[model samples]
Target: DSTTIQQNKDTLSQIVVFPTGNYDKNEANAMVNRLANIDGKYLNALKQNNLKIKLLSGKLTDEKEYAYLKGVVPAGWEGTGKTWDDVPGLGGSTVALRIGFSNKGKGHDAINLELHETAHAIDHIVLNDISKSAQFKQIFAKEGRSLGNVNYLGVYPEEFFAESFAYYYLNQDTNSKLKSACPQTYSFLQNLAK
Candidate 1:
């Protein structure tokens, strides 16, 4: 979706870019440099918004690894992704977002996909806990689950949150707009940054 693309771009704007595809070292370095050249103000906005991002140059081949990256959903969790056993909630904080792309596009497609996943990582750290705080409750009340961590098919909550966070935070630039779009997500990110 458009939100996914924007989120990846936002993430690429901040973190170092690594190219691991068929591209040469110079080309890979150029990719990172190009990403670094993005507007700092925009990158700052993304970071301040608590967006997580990692850029990897590889293909997602392992089924187990892909499942792990996709995350799992508990029973009665009315989301759009598949389910997994013993899914970790907040415990997945230390998890690193793995972005694998085949350079499907010329511009920022890879970065955009990576950022969408990064958003999920950010969500894992900030959300997923009832003991969090009153602020979180308020945000959830407003944002309505902040996008389930699941997508149609085998995707799970982790990917769901990543996609959702990337979509909302990337587009949100103000308190009022952000609150309206995703008050729970916005508040969680805001408080997490503190």
Candidate 2:
């Protein structure tokens, strides 16, 4: 039923099956639709900045493909397994978020993966900008303090930001470890969700 596959795009991102294969078209469409419906401050920032994301529905199966898609070798990746790119001077547009899917396809883990990657996109596209508001700087600072200098057990500041962003919406409970570590950041995220 691969022929039944349909491509989808939204103001935020474009989604299509990777040239590789073995994806369930219906499932892929569902995942893309789900991603489109996701709402929050991070997503809002992406929209306000006019950044776009592109999702390829397949895993990185080879180094050549990875290099071509990511513009670097697999060793160059720093955060989540997913890759992101920001193209400047491309005519009023710059941000391009690329998300790679694992063979696991669309599952609960896939949703988490997408959200995590989207968090990184938000960081690069919105938070990292020099024009960001004072509130963003303060929140990041507090989060950074909570994260310390290095990422221990995935506790890096950037990783924590992305993790906290996802958890803010995925689970509103205030007792989570991230919330405990960066209460101010958690508070800011709560406000953003409101």
Candidate 3:
């Protein structure tokens, strides 16, 4: 099946989609543009790292799309499970970043999904081992004080860093709990943005 490729106005990103399939062109464009709206540093991180996204029709169950992705996503990458409404999106290896649309299509929620996955891409692909970073050690120590387990972050350092990075960028409240919980980590991300 042939697909149409939509490029962002700024040329920072591109989305390939089926022209007349179940996918929504407007929604796809909006998501890609919203992703581009993220700080240029992050967008540059993705671009510099060669990350690209494909918006496929239907859910992950679509065999063709899934097969296409299997070739891209690394062997051990576990995509988000189906139970969550947000499972429609996923990020892993630079070759595997993707977003799927439901039968009715998507809206602003796509922004959150894209940001979360992009955080993963930034941590894994661009930064290349966030666990060993001094920032992760600082965050693990601080989070352990209250969570009672520094290994909680270490057990899934990539996820912890990605989640914290997502919240730090998407939730702008300086007084928000995410900022308060990992103040040093938040400061680290702030410096990264600079």
Candidate order by TM-score, decreasing, is 3, 2, 1
Instruction: Rank the candidate models, highest lDDT first.
Output: 3, 2, 1
Query: Candidate 3 lDDT, tens digit per residue, 1-194?
Result: 01111233354543223333655567766656555545666566667666765565544434354545433433233383423222466666642223444222352132256666667777777777774577676676556333222443335556566556656655356226567777777677777778
Residue 57 local lDDT, model 1: 41
Q: How accurate is candidate 2 locally (lDDT)?
A: 0.45
The number of residue pairs in model 2 that clash at the backbone is 0
lDDT winner: 3
Between candidates 1 and 3, the TM-score winner: 3
* Candidate lDDT (C-alpha), each: 0.40, 0.45, 0.53
| Model 1 alpha-carbon miss at residue 145, Å | 6.1
Best by TM-score: 3
lDDT of 1 by residue, 1-194 (tens): 54544554556655544434453555444443333333344355446655534333442222344455444454455474544332211113332222323132321222234334344444445444332346544444444443432232113434433434444444334335545666566565555545
TM-score of each: 0.38, 0.50, 0.63
The RMSD (Cα, Å) of candidate 1 is 9.5
Question: What ranges in model 1 sit over 4 Å off?
Answer: 1-19, 23-58, 62-112, 125-138, 145-164, 167-177
Pairs of residues clashing in candidate 2 = none
Model 2, span 1-194: residue lDDT tens: 12212211343342222334454666555545544434534455776776655444333333243345444322234565444222110101232222334222332122245555566666667767321457766666546545343433133445556556655544335237557887887777666657
